[PDB]
Structure 1
Amino acid sequence: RFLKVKNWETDVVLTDTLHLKSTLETGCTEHICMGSIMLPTKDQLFPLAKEFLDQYYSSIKRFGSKAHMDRLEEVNKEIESTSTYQLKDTELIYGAKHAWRNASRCVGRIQWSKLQVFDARDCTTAHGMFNYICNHVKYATNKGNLRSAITIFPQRTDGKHDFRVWNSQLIRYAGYKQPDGSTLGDPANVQFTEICIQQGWKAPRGRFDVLPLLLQANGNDPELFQIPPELVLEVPIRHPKFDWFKDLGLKWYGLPAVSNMLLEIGGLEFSACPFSGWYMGTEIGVRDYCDNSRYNILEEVAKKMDLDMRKTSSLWKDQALVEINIAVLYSFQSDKVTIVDHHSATESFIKHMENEYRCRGGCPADWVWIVPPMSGSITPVFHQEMLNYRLTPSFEYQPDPWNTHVW
């Protein structure tokens, strides 16, 4: 019931007790582990509220205080009466930071307590959402000195008045299915680039077009908005060695801003809660550039390096992969845009993990996601045993809106 995790490079053993406060489920049973699966009423509500208020009031050294009991009473009264309840700003901020702190797949959690929370619960229209999102983008970007932030739109009431950002990220590059058969731009965004083109967007059918925003307020049909280019910080990709690298025609945006997740605090559901940090270099260079079902230019880069691409055993893909990631990092660092290499971030995470074991009794972590997509075993997280479990408040996945939307 008290679990120990071992690091095999250092022999350090940590003891986990925090898992015992887990409430949601893993998908795993005693007979089968699903660790590598990517996507595993008034009476429901009060225990959920109680649990949260209990941990909130504990965090401020006022468990079993009049205020705590008062608040529990007030919330209880609101629930029976109104069929939902409203979070105080302090609770909203606490809940958002803890949803990040609890994100078992996030390697960047050492930064969890420094999150700027934007209360957008007074928003009523897509134009309102656009304004809030522009402000978020401007604030988070900070001329390249990136700052973590989240903007929270009104909570679900009854499933018919959902606020939803249809984009998966605030800033992404378009992708179009051509008649030649291949693909122009970002292959991940093909179906989405289509729906924009459908919904009225004029695609400049190019390769690196910043997608428009598709915003759904109060359950209504979604609306297109172009983000002001001066708010979209982009980074030209060059190599500190291959002068031919710039000729490839590659750039990327500085702000990773995930916008399709659901934020759960005290039983309440926030279906629209875009949040942003800054990139780990491998997200762009390994996944975004060199994945097959993405920009997939490993082949092209190796060509210009004149590597032997006849046999896989020359490791030309590995050689190219590294140089590319050197460039991404180089380009961002030159342009003074915040970025972290996977060696620094994983080192940071080990320290965060030990801090959390020390001050909280645990840190839920998903090894499958925490270990970087290149050079895994030369990073410290590879030899670190992790325990994965679901704590609340939390970020959850939700279905794409188009599959769901009652038009």
Structure 2
Amino acid sequence: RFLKVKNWETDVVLTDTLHLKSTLETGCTEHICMGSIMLPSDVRTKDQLFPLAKEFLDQYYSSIKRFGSKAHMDRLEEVNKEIESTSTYQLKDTELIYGAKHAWRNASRCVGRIQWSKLQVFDARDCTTAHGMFNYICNHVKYATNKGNLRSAITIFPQRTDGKHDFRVWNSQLIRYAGYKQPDGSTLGDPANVQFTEICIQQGWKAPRGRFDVLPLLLQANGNDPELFQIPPELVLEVPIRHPKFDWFKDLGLKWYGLPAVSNMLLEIGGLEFSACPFSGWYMGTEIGVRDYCDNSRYNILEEVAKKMDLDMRKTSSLWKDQALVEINIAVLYSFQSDKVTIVDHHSATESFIKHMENEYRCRGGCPADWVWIVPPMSGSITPVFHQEMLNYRLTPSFEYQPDPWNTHVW
């Protein structure tokens, strides 16, 4: 039970002991593996909270080489007393930064984790209003965008108290394109965002009804009704998509935004639940070119591109979809690189992740990793992660999924 993972391309064997620190559950059993299920899975009682805090503070003081020290025991006692009285507790800034960086470090589905320690943490726990949230988010977007030299960042709004006063960003990402159902049956814009684009309109948002309309922010503070805000356009950096060989590619009229900023997850540190914690990095090209542009349930541009390439679209075995998919992804990378906007291709990112795995096994004893999500959605087996065995287990602090607010909110 000191498990080993083999890379079948290189025969490198790593030994994993970190999984024995794991606490939460995978969803699998000895009789059935749920590793391809998208998502397995109210306030914390006074009891379950102190063990959670103790375990977190134990690993925090170990990381600063002060395990079993005066400061350690004192902080343990201090939090112990705060919980006994207040039925919760507040993190020190140092603890908050550590917790957020390690929630990313532990995100087994994230291929970009070699960067985990270079995370800018914005403490927004003093925020009280949607207008305040808007201000914090604009500052985040501007800092992270950095005129195309993207920088990772997270903004952490106040923690859940009793489930009635939740801070929530209702958008799934800070920047996403609208989607509208057409009278004929098709969809203009992003089909993934049709219900959200409806809620915004069904809320007051005057939609331009374009193909790439930046959605408004929909911000919930202290559990009140959410509020619409328009992100200043000069803060939304966008890349027009063109192809270094094909001039007609520009004519397609495609663009995408530079900042991937996920805003609907829940950050758990020491038992405390941060329901509003938008975070951002930079794109891997396939997220746009493969999934955003070519998923059948998204922009689904594959037919158009192949047609303009004059490919034989009559039989699947001509691999016209594969041919078009590559060209699309060459264009995305070329466009971002041309406009000096940070982006990583899937070969670079998976090579980086293999090196990160080696680092984590060496300096930490392991790295939880979800093969189903780490292997890119194109050209899987020519990237080094395809041939890498991975162990998936759930460490804390962590980012977790949470329900969509409009299914919960007492309106």
Provide the TM-score with structure 1 as the length reference.
Answer: 1.00
- CA shift, 1:57, in A, is 0.2
Partner Cα distance (2:327, 2:253) in 1: 16
- CA shift, 1:112, in A, is 0.2
Partner Cα distance (2:209, 2:330) in 1: 30
What SS does the aligned partner of 1:195 have?
Answer: helix
1:110 corresponds to:
114
Partner Cα distance (2:327, 2:252) in 1: 14
1:23 corresponds to:
23
Partner Cα distance (2:366, 2:191) in 1: 39
Partner Cα distance (2:286, 2:272) in 1: 34
Paired residues for 1:368-383 under 5 Å:
368-383=372-387
What SS does the aligned partner of 2:294 have?
Answer: coil
Paired residues for 1:8-407 under 5 Å:
8-40=8-40, 41-407=45-411
Partner Cα distance (1:111, 1:292) in 2: 32
What SS does the aligned partner of 1:321 have?
Answer: helix
- CA shift, 1:122, in A, is 0.1
- CA shift, 1:306, in A, is 0.1
- CA shift, 1:11, in A, is 0.1
Partner Cα distance (2:359, 2:327) in 1: 34
Residue-by-residue CA offset, 1:295-354 (whole Å, 9 max, x unaligned) = 001000000000000000000000000000000000000000000000000000000000
- CA shift, 1:42, in A, is 1.2
- CA shift, 1:180, in A, is 1.0
Partner Cα distance (2:396, 2:76) in 1: 18
- CA shift, 1:105, in A, is 0.1
What SS does the aligned partner of 2:159 have?
Answer: coil
Residue-by-residue CA offset, 1:369-388 (whole Å, 9 max, x unaligned) = 00000000000000000000
Partner Cα distance (1:18, 1:267) in 2: 20
Residue-by-residue CA offset, 1:183-227 (whole Å, 9 max, x unaligned) = 000000000000000011000111100000000000000000000
Partner Cα distance (1:235, 1:256) in 2: 13
Partner Cα distance (1:155, 1:115) in 2: 20
- CA shift, 1:157, in A, is 0.3
Residue-by-residue CA offset, 1:250-309 (whole Å, 9 max, x unaligned) = 000000000000000000000000000000000000000000000001000000000000
Give unmatched runs, 5+ long, in structure 2: none
Partner Cα distance (1:7, 1:221) in 2: 51
Partner Cα distance (1:114, 1:316) in 2: 41
- CA shift, 1:169, in A, is 0.1
Partner Cα distance (1:90, 1:97) in 2: 11
Partner Cα distance (2:250, 2:297) in 1: 23
Partner Cα distance (2:182, 2:310) in 1: 29
What SS does the aligned partner of 2:180 have?
Answer: strand
- CA shift, 1:153, in A, is 0.0
Residue-by-residue CA offset, 1:3-51 (whole Å, 9 max, x unaligned) = 0000000000000000000000000000000000001111100000000
Partner Cα distance (1:15, 1:42) in 2: 38
Partner Cα distance (1:278, 1:8) in 2: 30
Partner Cα distance (2:95, 2:74) in 1: 15
What SS does the aligned partner of 1:355 have?
Answer: helix
Residue-by-residue CA offset, 1:98-140 (whole Å, 9 max, x unaligned) = 0000000000000000000000000000000000000000000
Partner Cα distance (2:89, 2:36) in 1: 36
Partner Cα distance (2:383, 2:184) in 1: 42
Partner Cα distance (1:326, 1:205) in 2: 29
Q: Percent identity?
A: 100
What SS does the aligned partner of 1:176 have?
Answer: strand
RMSD: 0.3
Partner Cα distance (2:185, 2:375) in 1: 35
Residue-by-residue CA offset, 1:60-112 (whole Å, 9 max, x unaligned) = 00000000000000000000000000000000000000000000000000000
- CA shift, 1:178, in A, is 1.1
Partner Cα distance (2:383, 2:153) in 1: 27
What SS does the aligned partner of 1:329 have?
Answer: helix
Partner Cα distance (1:404, 1:8) in 2: 46
Partner Cα distance (1:352, 1:118) in 2: 25
Partner Cα distance (1:380, 1:156) in 2: 40
Partner Cα distance (1:327, 1:177) in 2: 28
- CA shift, 1:406, in A, is 1.0
What SS does the aligned partner of 2:239 have?
Answer: strand
What SS does the aligned partner of 2:98 have?
Answer: helix
Partner Cα distance (1:42, 1:210) in 2: 43
Partner Cα distance (1:188, 1:249) in 2: 19
Partner Cα distance (2:301, 2:70) in 1: 62
Residue-by-residue CA offset, 1:349-401 (whole Å, 9 max, x unaligned) = 00000000000000000000000000000000000000000000000000000
What SS does the aligned partner of 1:340 have?
Answer: coil
What SS does the aligned partner of 1:172 have?
Answer: coil
